[PDB]
Structure 1
Amino acid sequence: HLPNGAQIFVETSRGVEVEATAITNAENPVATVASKGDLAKGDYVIVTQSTWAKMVSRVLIVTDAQETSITLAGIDTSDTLVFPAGGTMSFAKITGWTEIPCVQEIGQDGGEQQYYTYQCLSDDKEQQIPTFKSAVSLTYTFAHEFDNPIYPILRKLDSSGQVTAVRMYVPKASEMRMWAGILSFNDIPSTQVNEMETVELAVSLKGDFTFISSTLA
């Protein structure tokens, strides 16, 4: 298993909102949407709002294109009791994607669980209570091509903060990952003699990673 050959894409445009009245809570979630509009098999959907704590901004996939009962399989399993019975959801389908020219470095900063420390007289050692998990950000570095159409799109997405979707596909394991976040795009290119010029892009997560097989497509 090697990461060679993987390529990363970003969202271009999204359609109008679609409302899901009811969601089943087991294995692959099922969304009961009346008169679905252009939701075939294999499309990608971004959840924009919900009342189920998780799954707020996580990208999912539609496997069944039924008229009234859309089954957004994806990865998330709602069988756990953490998600209560009553649940609402709103999602938008993605239209197209654009590929980053030449990624040469991927690095991630963040994570780690924060704790609250206390000690009473009875206690012999200091005790801790978990409080929350810090944020995670990634930086991508790619080559400089001022004619590349990705530059206006990145500039526009940076101008107005919006939770876009990012996809990257690894061919060796036929595995597909998806996440959503805000994009802040630097554009001043660092130049060094006898070395290619590079530009750097940063993403701040708003959800969790999704792992699927490429067979679903």
Structure 2
Amino acid sequence: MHLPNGAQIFVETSRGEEIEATAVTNEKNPVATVASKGDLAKGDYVIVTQSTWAKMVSRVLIVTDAQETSITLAGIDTSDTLVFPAGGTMSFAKITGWTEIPCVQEIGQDGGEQQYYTYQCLSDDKEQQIPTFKSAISLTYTFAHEFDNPIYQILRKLDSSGQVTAVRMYVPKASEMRMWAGILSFNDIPSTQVNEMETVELAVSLKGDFTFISSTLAS
């Protein structure tokens, strides 16, 4: 029960060395075994690049506990076992830094309308429909245009590469954190009109699922 004003946007800029996990258990808060400590620490995000489990791939997780061999990740529930067969191995990297877009004018989205399959049986008369797949979700952002902004080069090279990038969005009023990753696209044609600011647009597709983490737990 809150107003979404005051939110902020951040985007992934550089990722560390790939880290391989050999086995992870299933529970409310998953914990996995890692070959080495590496450079992991308290409260730094990770992106999973590929794994045996189909649902968990392309997801942003937050580290909970760190030890020499045990790493604890929260943000995903693994209580169910049939959907999460045992003996799965993880593979993820870490996000070294973050960058923040200048002040953003509006936020828009599209899709999400659930589809239905309509079937009529000759035995009955009333027609009944069943739910089906969901439409794709695309997040588009618009913000002030700047000639010398240093993030423009980052966005251009990210668009050229097409590599999957993590996006962070923080809400102060409700104190949640939204984690998701997708393909980024950028537009560099100014919206030129008369007697108002001119903008450029940025769109983010979706590759995984939204995960929400408490701000205090995150930091």
Q: Summarize the Cα distance change of 1:161–1:30 in structure 2 as closer, same or farther, 3 Å threshold.
A: same
Deviation for aligned residue 1:76: 3.6
* Cα separation, 1, equivalents of 2:181 and 2:163: 10
SS of 1:145 mapped into structure 2: coil
Deviation for aligned residue 1:115: 2.3
Aligned residues of 1:27 and 1:79 also touching (Cα < 8 A): no
Unaligned runs of 5+ residues in structure 2 are none
Aligned residues of 2:117 and 2:130 also touching (Cα < 8 A): yes
Unaligned runs of 5+ residues in structure 1 are none
* Cα separation, 1, equivalents of 2:29 and 2:154: 33
Deviation for aligned residue 1:25: 0.6
Aligned residues of 1:75 and 1:212 also touching (Cα < 8 A): no
The residue aligned with 1:195 is: 196
* Cα separation, 1, equivalents of 2:32 and 2:171: 29
Aligned residues of 1:7 and 1:170 also touching (Cα < 8 A): yes
The residue aligned with 1:28 is: 29
The residue aligned with 1:178 is: 179
The residue aligned with 1:68 is: 69
**What's the CA shift string for 1:42-84, capped at 9, x where partnerless?**
0100011122221111100011111111111124444453211
* Cα separation, 2, equivalents of 1:53 and 1:122: 40
Deviation for aligned residue 1:15: 1.3
**What's the CA shift string for 1:162-208, capped at 9, x where partnerless?**
11000011112221111100001001011222201111011111111
* Cα separation, 2, equivalents of 1:127 and 1:32: 49
Q: TM-score scaled by structure 1?
A: 0.94
**What's the CA shift string for 1:95-141, capped at 9, x where partnerless?**
11110101110011011222222223223333434332221001100
Q: Summarize the Cα distance change of 1:118–1:69 in structure 2 as closer, same or farther, 3 Å threshold.
A: same
SS of 2:4 mapped into structure 1: coil
Deviation for aligned residue 1:89: 1.3
The residue aligned with 2:155 is: 154
SS of 1:208 mapped into structure 2: coil
Residue 54 (structure 2) pairs with residue 53 (structure 1): yes
The residue aligned with 1:137 is: 138
* Cα separation, 2, equivalents of 1:80 and 1:186: 44
Aligned residues of 1:181 and 1:204 also touching (Cα < 8 A): yes
Deviation for aligned residue 1:86: 2.2
* Greater Cα offset, 167-176 or 197-206: 167-176
Deviation for aligned residue 1:147: 1.0
**What's the CA shift string for 1:13-66, capped at 9, x where partnerless?**
101211111111101111111112111110100011122221111100011111
Aligned residues of 1:29 and 1:78 also touching (Cα < 8 A): no
* Cα separation, 1, equivalents of 2:46 and 2:214: 17
Aligned residues of 2:47 and 2:166 also touching (Cα < 8 A): yes
Aligned residues of 2:27 and 2:77 also touching (Cα < 8 A): no
* Cα separation, 2, equivalents of 1:59 and 1:174: 18
- Structure with greater strand share of residues: 1
* Greater Cα offset, 122-131 or 195-204: 122-131
Q: Summarize the Cα distance change of 1:96–1:78 in structure 2 as closer, same or farther, 3 Å threshold.
A: farther
Q: TM-score scaled by structure 2?
A: 0.93
